């Protein structure tokens, strides 16, 4: 009779046994990230492998952050740890013919495209706010090059950390040391400072200023100007003199001797009473 | 058959109870697929004792290998006219932090880092890489390299301009050395201090133009200069002892005494 | 009854509703929160979103690991070669008025480190390669407030343990260049020291083995340690002083004074 109809009920409708309810459907969704946004406590790993990840500096990258709508930063990395077993980030590559870098900087902008800044610490340490390796005997360690126009392609400014005048007597600018290799080194013929002009200039090698006065330079023909005076623990060679306040060699010195004593031996051998 | 009737009352799924497919599509495509997708939101990462390492391998909060996969890691781009802080932020705040915020473990062929600063429509006071440490105990920046025949820091001036003079008032290098900002009374600072702590062959300073050599610092400290060159002042020598060494004062009064004396006894002694 | 019709309205059909089984298969495709694998593109494209530039909890990534051990973030390669670089960032608009990266850092290593690894064979490659097309500005500039260190360290290492292996390299090379595409020449300094408030150090100091080799002083005077040359003519002032080199004029005046010295006893004996 209706037995059918109470059959087919039990046949084409779900039992809530074999089907999520919808409040069992929200604890299974709350555990999956939303697009719109959320909070990931464990590792999120990336592993692409034929996904058709690009190398563009626009839209390519494993992870791509395009913030052209939107304020903010792209990425933020904070610690607050006392101590901690890494660093916050950390990029690597493995293979000697790896043939791009680690990190590109493309810059188009009006403030500094990297800066890195190292607050006071409550105790002075070793430690810098950038440190540069190489093992490469190849290549440069480091490279930069500029195109300014009345300023420098590197600035260095060392500002005295005390009020007192004294306080930093051993600091410099730029501190430079020449080292034999560490393990078993024999020594090194390696040179401090090179300057060269390839192309050749017209403007002062080495220019050397206090108070912004002119105090020593070396001109773009090798030859300097000292602004006050000055030792040689040595001998200096130099050419005959031609003008008045040049330094007279042992050569001109000896010559002008010479001529006065056969001047004069000449007069005491002629006179007559 | 009341009984056969209350027993679908209880075992089956009401509507009202249960996601349709239809709306659990909807649901799902809120979700961040395996596969990939968009997010439009923040995503925060708030690891907390879920065993997070700092292999520089298979370690961090996020692990990017790039091992089976052509393109870039990671990539932060912006088209923004303006914006209200930078693309990429790394902060550490407690001074006893004892790790890097980065660490660049690089092999390969080319540059490891490599920062561009593309020419701007109006030039400006910006910088490619700035650098600023308030740590009195440290240098602001190290570089080592184990160059064979190199600069470990090499340093380029190109003129920005056709016109040979344009670039008079630039430098390669420019160094300035100041007194505390607030409330300095002044400054004993060095410019440029060169060592060999192991000790050097080489010249420790070497100037050239056009390739030739032009002014040098031997390792002995005695120096080469290619041109007439001038001291505002007095230059203190050592006596020469050869005939284009500089003559002192010395020499040159003791030359002059041997003649006088020589002459002045020859004038007392000798007869007509 | 037609009981049966509301049981027909009220209850769902199999063929319009997901299994367990079906919903776990969808469910086990999306990101759990405690973590997995993405073998995808993520692509983060905020708008309107309400993405802060804080430095502590802004970012559409942020990272916190105060309250974890281990790195923030580690991108890692073994690929024998590659298209592009790991990590990229661009600004493309010249009126941007941020940087691409800025590092805040506490603490007591070094912030960034940045280190090149022995190679197989040498090759022209660095750490670290910075170039700026922007006349009115450093390519880089650095600050730092050192008691007794220098500002920037450099140090030239060996490679090698013959001592005269690394005899072409240095410390510092700086090199001073004509435009590239037409350049007529240049007249850009090599290094130019300062001390706009004036310093009592001395501008340039040498030494080797940690002894004084040469110096500049702060007056520009200098002090040279051993036998040196000019290839020209060295003007001075006239010597007040028996080590003080000699000027032509005080050779001629000295030699001047004796000769009118001896030519007055000449003119002046009797016998
Ligand atoms: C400091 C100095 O004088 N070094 C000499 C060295 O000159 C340098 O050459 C490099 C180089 O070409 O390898 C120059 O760096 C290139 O700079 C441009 C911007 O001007 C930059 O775009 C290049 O980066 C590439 O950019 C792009 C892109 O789409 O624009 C994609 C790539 O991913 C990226 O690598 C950059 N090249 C590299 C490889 O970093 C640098 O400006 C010069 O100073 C010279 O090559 C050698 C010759 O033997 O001598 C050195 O002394
Ligand atoms: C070509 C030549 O020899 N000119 C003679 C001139 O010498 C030049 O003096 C100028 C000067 O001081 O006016 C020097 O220019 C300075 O160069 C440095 C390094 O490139 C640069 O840092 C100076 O900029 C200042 O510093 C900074 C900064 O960020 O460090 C920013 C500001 O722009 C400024 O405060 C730069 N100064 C200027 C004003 O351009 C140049 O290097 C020297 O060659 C000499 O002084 C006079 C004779 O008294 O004759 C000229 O012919
Ligand atoms: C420029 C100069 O002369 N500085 C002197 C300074 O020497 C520098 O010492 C540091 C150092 O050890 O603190 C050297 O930096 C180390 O370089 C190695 C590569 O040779 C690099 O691997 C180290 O990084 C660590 O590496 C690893 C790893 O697994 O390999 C893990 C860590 O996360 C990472 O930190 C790197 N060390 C640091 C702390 O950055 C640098 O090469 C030297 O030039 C010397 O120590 C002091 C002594 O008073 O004097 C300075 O003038
Ligand atoms: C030890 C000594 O005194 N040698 C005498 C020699 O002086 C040497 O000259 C060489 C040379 O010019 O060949 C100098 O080598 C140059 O050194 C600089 C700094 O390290 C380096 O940049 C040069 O490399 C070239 O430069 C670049 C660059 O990017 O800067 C690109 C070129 O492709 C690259 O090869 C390097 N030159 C070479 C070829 O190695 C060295 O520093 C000087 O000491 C002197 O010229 C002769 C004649 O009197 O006698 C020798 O005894
Ligand atoms: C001598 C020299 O090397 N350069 C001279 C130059 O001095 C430099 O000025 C910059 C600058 O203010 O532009 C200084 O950099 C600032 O350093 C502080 C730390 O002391 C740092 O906080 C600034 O960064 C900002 O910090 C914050 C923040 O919350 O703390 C937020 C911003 O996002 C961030 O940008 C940093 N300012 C920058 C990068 O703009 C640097 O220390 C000085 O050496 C001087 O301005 C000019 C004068 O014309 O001459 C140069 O020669
Ligand atoms: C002010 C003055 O003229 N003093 C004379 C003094 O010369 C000074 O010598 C000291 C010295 O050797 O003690 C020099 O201090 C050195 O300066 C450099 C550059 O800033 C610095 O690197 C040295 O630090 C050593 O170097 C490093 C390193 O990583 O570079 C690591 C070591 O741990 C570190 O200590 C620094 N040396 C020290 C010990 O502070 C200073 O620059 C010179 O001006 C001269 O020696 C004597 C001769 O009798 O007279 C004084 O008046
Ligand atoms: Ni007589």
Do not use: C, W
């Not at 495209?113 to 006071?120: G, P, S, Y």
Request: proline share 3%; hydrophobic share 30%; no cysteine.
């Amino acid at each position: 009779e209706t037995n059918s109809k109470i059959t087919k009920l039990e046949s084409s409708k779900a039992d809530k046994s074999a089907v999520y309810s919808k409040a069992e459907s929200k604890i299974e969704l709350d555990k999956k990230l939303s697009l719109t946004g959320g909070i990931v406590t464990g590792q999120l790993q990336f592993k692409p492998n034929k996904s058709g990840i690009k190398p563009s500096s626009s839209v390519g990258g494993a992870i791509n952050i395009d913030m052209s709508k939107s304020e903010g930063a792209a990425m933020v990395m904070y610690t607050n740890k006392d101590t901690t077993d890494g660093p916050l980030m950390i990029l690597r590559s493995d293979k000697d013919t790896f043939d791009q870098s680690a990190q590109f900087v493309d810059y188009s902008g009006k403030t500094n495209a990297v800066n890195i800044v190292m607050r006071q610490p409550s105790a002075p340490n070793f430690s810098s706010a950038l440190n540069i390796t190489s093992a490469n005997e190849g290549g440069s360690a480091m490279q930069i090059r500029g195109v300014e126009k009345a300023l420098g392609t590197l600035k260095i400014t060392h500002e005295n950390p005390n009020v007192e005048a004294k306080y930093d007597e051993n600091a410099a600018a730029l501190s430079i040391d020449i080292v034999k290799k560490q393990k078993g080194g024999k020594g090194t013929a390696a040179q401090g400072i090179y300057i060269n002009s390839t192309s050749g200039t017209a403007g002062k090698m080495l220019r050397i200023r206090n108070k912004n006065e002119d105090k020593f330079y070396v001109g773009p023909d090798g030859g300097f100007h000292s602004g006050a005076n000055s030792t040689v623990a040595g001998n200096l060679t130099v050419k005959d003199p031609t003008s008045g306040k040049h330094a007279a060699t042992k050569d001109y010195v000896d010559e002008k001797i010479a001529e006065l004593k056969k001047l004069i031996l000449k007069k005491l051998e002629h006179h007559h009473h």
